[model samples]
Target: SRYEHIPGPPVLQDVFLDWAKKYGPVVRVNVFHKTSVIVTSPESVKKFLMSTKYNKDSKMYRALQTVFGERLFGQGLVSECNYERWHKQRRVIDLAFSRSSLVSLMETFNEKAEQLVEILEAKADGQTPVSMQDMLTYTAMDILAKAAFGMETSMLLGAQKPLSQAVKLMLEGITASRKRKQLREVRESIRFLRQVGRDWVQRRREALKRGEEVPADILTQILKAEEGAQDDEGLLDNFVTFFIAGHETSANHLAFTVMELSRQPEIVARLQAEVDEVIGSKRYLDFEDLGRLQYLSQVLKESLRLYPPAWGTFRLLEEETLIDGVRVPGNTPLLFSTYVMGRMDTYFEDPLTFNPDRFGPGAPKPRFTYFPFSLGHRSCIGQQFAQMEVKVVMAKLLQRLEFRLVPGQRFGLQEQATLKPLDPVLCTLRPRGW
Candidate 1:
């Protein structure tokens, strides 16, 4: 019934949201012969996602295992479905993204964010339009490269690196599944990315053998896991996984935050005030200061509420499940979306409005109604890392530059591997005056 009158593909999430409004929270949707359930109820979301009973839909994740017949994500942390295997990998990866480890990377985040500021400084004449998404994506790429891989990507410096191109193509390929003509290019891109990972892994191993000092990065942690004779394939899986996952989603989050702030000046001013109060005139942002940006935190939370980068997660039932008393048959694909739930009036009061107060310190936390990074055991391992990275970049941006959204550009979402702005978030920047 939901598919009959509604157009599909790119606007599919919107259709699901519309159906949730019309038919109630639990809606069943089908594409061709495949059946899926969309669960919006807070209880159902907890039942299905907050526990480890249901595995990620293999059918959905299989597409990610390869891109154009080349191993892309492989059986990485994100795509790994075997609970035991995923648990082991998650344990090793958890160390790299731990609070202490991420805190140590503050200088790296600051350096990369400053690079972005420098790039925008040239365009801060208030006339030359800049694509804030592009700038933010590049900054994110560089940060992940340095902080995780312990290498300088320099992509933020406008270096047309093959690794960067490969990452971009792989992302595009995920959304271009229907475009057969792009298959060869996508395959080549995956091959390039894999080769780079292989080279990095080999180099890191050689450095370890030489007893040379190696930085404690994500790659270092992965190699440490391999010292126990862990599968090489698993190592490669995480190498590629961190490359993509560590940066892409966070970049989208930052871009969307800017887009929302562009449309709301009062919120921006309030957020800026918090940043000013917490950070003051310091050129460096310490890990301790991150928690002090109270309103900025709200803005980030509300931004995630409106545009969750991960959007939704899918689980294939191991057995027949009762979702909100609806007996969903075994083997069914179940979906729980923060995107849908965040906009629902049942969960959030004034759902459509971009109000940060919904996440204020004194405000009651919405239970199970919001999970931008996802929920439970399978939630994003890099959640804290991404949050810190975003805060550092955003704080610096707000402290240094004033942004003005370029007029006459219609902003919309381009749903792909993650949700991104369809059009470039073109804007003009100017240096902020105290």
Candidate 2:
């Protein structure tokens, strides 16, 4: 009977909508060897993700603990339980990502965006196949380095060879290895990551002590969280968590958006036109330029609709949580597939189409149904920073170059640490004439 109730792909294809349609709006599925509830309805999405009943520290956070160790930073706002501690830390984190701070970040964003454009243009001149994935990763890493260390480093140059490979191998191996394992193997893997994570913390701490001003990037915010408390060592643990969460997750989203735009030329032209109109033809974009490029914002939002970086979000039933009269036992996993919700016919008209207008002003839709960065108290702290980065990068590129996906390139999705193109997202670019 339990097997009969499970609704999910046996091997995890792009089976989001197929499972949703077959299982109805709300259904139970088995994943990570746990019974999880999948919510697809807009009303149900609101009732669950936005409500206190679906709080963090559920089975979802526990699942992540395997890879991230007990780093408080990786715990994000969602995984933390202490209300006062979360509130204070969130305030500091929020300040760094706030509108005012984000405004200043646009300068840094523009600089990196220009550098990205230069890199692409050089590749275009040399007839090289540009990896949009790497570009996005470089942009995000550059931003994080600046925001965290106040240094301008070429992530493309700095992240060569084994460094990138190590990160990739580590995430893939851990994510795949954890599946179908018993307690002993799981414990061993967690212990392994915990030690490596501690090593990373020591490296960063040493970097800080060498007159390096690593300001309140996510790590500094978390460390300062226990400022007047005794257990400051928790910040070291959190540093590793926030490093991956902040760096990798946003980078993946930006890459998908670029890849999608490359696939649809008409949309790319329109977005470029909007960017040019908003920021003019000659000047580098700044914070003032962001609000005017509504179409580009929609493009990024639509990309998230298709391929949310998180792919799916989970929370466990704290007490007996009831949804539409069905009761879930304590610690039951509640999985909300934003990917599925984006394609649901009940919430969106022609849900599968790549239309940015679905998120534009005056588009009638429920609040909770469309959360790329998530919704409510535990929403992503870097939401504003991410949008600014995407906008600046997209705007600058469209002004100078145009992208086309490589011919015969079959776009496939991979779900390891984050959602990404399995095919490297290769594209051809040429300079645009004014």
Candidate 3:
């Protein structure tokens, strides 16, 4: 009878919202031999995620343990708990990701974006259909590779297959590894697959040894700062984390945004017009260009609402707590699905509709209901980097190409470690007339 309390279809498919609708907003679900509580309401998410009382890592981090084994000298800021150690590490990350600090990285962003434009121009071949998701993934990966490792190898340009394959393999490995028993076994699986990722990292390091000018990516900066640190594994894990979490999520977000815009031509036209007015045809986008692309930002926000990349996030309580009259025992895992919350009418006005204005000033939605980058102390460290990258690339691409979805084409989602699309998001692209 207690098992019946769990929500969803008998086997629990990817349809998280369907289950949320059948059950109430807050329903318990068990998957992968783990007990999880799914929160669909904004109010519940705000109370649970924002509260200083609840621990964010908990069992969720335990799930990740299979992939991200314990670091030696243990200076992993992202994986660490909310203690003083985590705080110290997060401070440095925050410093790098803050808007003011990231301004200097605009040159790097522009270079990568320009590279994307070059690729598109070549692929379109005057009038060729292109996959926005494929291109965006390549571009985002290139930017991250440059930023994270200071290397200029371009995955989008079709030269970085090993790196791409490694990421794909690791993600697949981690997903399967998470479902397995014994942390040791999981680590062993991850370790075996990590060689592919490590090989790429070694290449990047070797380049640095030959006196090549490395870019000022996060990984390079971290290496420069922690030269004496004996824990190379710690550094490698961060690279893996940044590569998968960094590129794939942003790539999907951009793809979904394009999909939404293509579904509504008016929105796409308006976004393009805004980019034209803000950056113009001849100039490149800078950090200052971001403030002017308000609608584009809102569009990205709305896309995240409809199809959040990280579909679910979880937290575990350190002590007993009462949330919305429900008693949450100490050490119980609390799962919150942004996927379900974005679709619930209780949290938004016509939640299923794609309206960018919902993210505008003075919108009538609860605070934590719309956390694409997450929130509070545990929010994404590279959020600013992500936004800046997405905005620039989206703006630039839209300005250069007129995108249209292939007729009768279907876009579906694949639920992996992240919400990835099952098929390539193919779209026809024509050069925009001046």
**lDDT per residue (tens digit) for residues 1-434 in model 2:** 53343444451524656777876776776656566777777677777677664565445555454453422334445456555656766887665665676676667788788888888877775357888888788778777767654545467655544444445654564456433444344445444445555665566679878977554555556656656756544564455455556568778887787777777889888987887777777658766778888888888888888778776777656676556556556666676777777777777788878898887799875467778788767677777777777778778888889787877766667877567777777888888872
lDDT of 3 by residue, 1-434 (tens): 43353444561234567777787665667665566667776677777778666556545665554455632112355555556656655555455565665787777778888887877766664356787777888888878766766666667668867556555655555465444444454445455435544776687688879887755556654554445668566566555566567688998888877777888988888888998899897547867789889999889888888888887677776676655556555566777877777877777879878898887878776567778777766778888888888898888887887777877656667765677666667777777883
The candidate 1 region of ten consecutive residues with least summed lDDT is 1-10
Report the C-alpha lDDT of model 1 over 1-434, residue by residue, as the tens digit: 42232222235678789888887766777741366778889888888887887789867777688766788888888998888888887898788887789889999998998888878877789889999888888899899988998888788888846776777778888766625557777898888887788888888878889999987889978776666664577788888899899899999999999988998988878777888898898878998899888788888999999999888788887676666656667777778899999988988888989988898777899999999989989998899899899999999998888899999766688877788888789998888882
Candidate 2 TM-score, true structure as reference: 0.85
- lDDT (Cα) of model 3: 0.70
Model 1 regions lying over 4 Å from their true place: 1-10, 178-180, 228-231
Clashing pairs in 3: 147-217
What would the TM-scores of all predictions be?
A: 0.94, 0.85, 0.86
What TM-score does candidate 1 reach? Answer: 0.94
Local distance difference test, per candidate?
Answer: 0.83, 0.68, 0.70
On lDDT, the candidate that comes out on top is 1
